């Protein structure tokens, strides 16, 4: 019955100082909220960084410090490193339970930004023979690894039917993800313009098919 809010994504460069914040929907964050900061590296790898607002877990580099800034809990990375690229979650205590924030995806540029490579495929015909149609939108080689994928059937933002995977790290250290829009053989034949729009580090890429 409280909502912790965190920045969605933050991008920095090795050597910089970056601050992540944790806001509580009920009021200012205070020391009795015992702000905790947790880091998630790929592979479902969790480690605790800070607890009780400013206590650094043992074996967590000193570049990490927590504090209260204004009415919120903050985590500062002083001299961010390439290794710090991960998802940081804050947790706040509320007298009887814990509420976790949505997490902040932090990117520490370890190579130049790279735009996504988007491709939209039409439902194959063997599949239209099943009374089904699935438009696949593939997005690869993007960095920072955060995107927004929006589908638009006939000019209208589809809002149900789509599924977008979570960015997965490729070998070169760039990311990939694909989004699926499943229609029926029939929904397929009805509408006429499909489009997969991918938003990445401010530029947009729209790939449209025409039935």
């Amino acid at each position: 019955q409280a909502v912790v809010t965190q920045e969605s994504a933050l991008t920095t460069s090795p050597g910089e100082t970056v601050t992540l914040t944790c806001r509580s929907s009920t009021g200012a964050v205070t020391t009795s909220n015992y702000a905790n900061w947790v880091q998630e590296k790929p592979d479902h790898l969790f480690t605790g960084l800070i607890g009780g607002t400013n206590n650094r877990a043992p074996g967590v580099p000193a570049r990490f410090s927590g504090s209260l800034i204004g009415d919120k809990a903050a985590l500062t990375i002083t001299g961010a490193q390439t290794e710090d690229e991960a998802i940081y979650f804050c947790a706040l205590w509320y007298s009887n339970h814990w509420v976790f924030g949505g997490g902040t995806k932090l990117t520490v540029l370890g190579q130049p930004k790279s735009s996504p490579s988007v491709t939209l495929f039409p439902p194959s015909s063997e599949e239209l023979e099943t009374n089904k149609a699935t438009l696949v939108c593939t997005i690869t080689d993007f960095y920072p690894g955060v995107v927004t994928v929006d589908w638009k059937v006939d000019g209208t933002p589809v809002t149900q039917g789509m599924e977008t995977t979570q960015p997965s790290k490729q070998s070169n250290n760039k990311y990939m993800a694909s989004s699926y829009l499943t229609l029926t053989a029939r929904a397929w034949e009805r509408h006429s313009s499909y489009s997969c729009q991918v938003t990445h580090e401010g530029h947009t890429v729209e790939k449209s098919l025409s039935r």
Binding site: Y34, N36, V38, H44, L45, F46, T47, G48, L49, I50, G51, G52, N55, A57, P58, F89, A91, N96, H97, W98, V99, F100, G101, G102, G103, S117, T119, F121, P122, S124, S125, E126, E127, T130, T134, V136, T138, T140, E163, T165, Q166, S168, Q170, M176, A177, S178, Y180, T182, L209, S210
Partner: protein
């Protein structure tokens, strides 16, 4: 050498229950509280509740009050969590985390999470469908749809093609997984030179080859 061990995955049928374990070693079980967290990939973490290993006393998230039950076996140093009346929607990663309660108030050590998959399906082989474009380098791909269980292996030209191959993570879509794979081939190979995707699925012992032809 602090460690929280959790089994990696668990498959259960809908309507049943599961007892997830979390074996602790390298520290005194007792000086620390044990918390359980739910991670729906694509959503945050949700706190489930905690247990004090000394008294066995628990505190739950009201939301889970009726879905989870925390338990402890002091002697074997293990925390357990039962989840009842499971449904597709309970599928997710459940982690156990230690909390330095008498000390600095952090969730220092975490278990690797158990991926719970709740599904009524039976070994089901994939249906590979070819993805050719519509209109220098061209991207081809394969849709491996409605298979179960996980995993499947995708290969292009039986392995000859290993550069520019991207194989995406599967998504659980109605008790069944779907995954697709793509390869970027110069515009000269294709469609001059055949591109064929190969899908292998152990559980069901399938192997399907599908040639990507224009359409």
């Amino acid at each position: 050498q602090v460690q929280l061990q959790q089994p990696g995955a668990e498959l259960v049928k809908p309507g049943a229950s599961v007892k997830l374990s979390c074996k602790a070693s390298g520290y005194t079980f007792t000086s620390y509280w044990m918390h359980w967290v739910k991670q729906r990939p694509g959503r945050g973490l949700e706190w489930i509740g905690r247990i004090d290993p000394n008294s066995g006393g628990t505190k739950y998230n009201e939301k889970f009050k009726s879905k989870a039950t925390l338990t402890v076996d002091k002697p074997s140093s293990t925390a357990y969590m039962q989840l009842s009346s499971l449904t597709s929607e309970d599928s997710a990663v459940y982690y156990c985390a230690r909390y330095d309660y008498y000390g600095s108030s952090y969730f220092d050590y975490w278990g690797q999470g158990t991926t719970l998959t709740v599904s009524s399906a039976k070994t089901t082989p994939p249906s590979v469908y070819p993805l050719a474009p519509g209109s220098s380098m061209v991207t081809l791909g394969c849709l491996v749809k409605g298979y179960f269980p996980e995993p499947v292996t995708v290969t292009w030209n039986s392995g000859s093609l290993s550069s520019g191959v991207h194989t995406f993570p599967a998504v659980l879509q109605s008790d069944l997984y779907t995954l697709s794979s793509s390869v970027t081939v110069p515009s000269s190979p294709w469609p001059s030179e055949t591109v064929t995707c190969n899908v292998a699925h152990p559980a069901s012992s399938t192997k399907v080859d599908k040639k990507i032809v224009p359409r």
